[PDB]
């Protein structure tokens, strides 16, 4: 597709609150959180560690509902 997802731009430790440096946009398979939502993710905490290059999925972010 042309649908991009949010992909971790650095290792994000468990329980870190997301900042814009941590999130890039990439076309990856499977599809994760839409790249369009990166503004809406700042300050939300991840509930597990996300290695560099991992697609951010809905279940990894605390409080995320879309």
Curated annotation (Swiss-Prot):
InterPro entries, per database record: AFP_Neu5c_C, AFP_Neu5c_C_sf, Antifreeze_III
AFP-like domain span: 5-64
Keywords linked to the UniProt accession: Antifreeze protein, Secreted
Domain of life: Eukaryota
Expression sites by tissue: Detected in blood serum (at protein level).
Localization, UniProt: Secreted
Name used for this protein in its record: Type-3 ice-structuring protein HPLC 12
Protein species of origin: Zoarces americanus
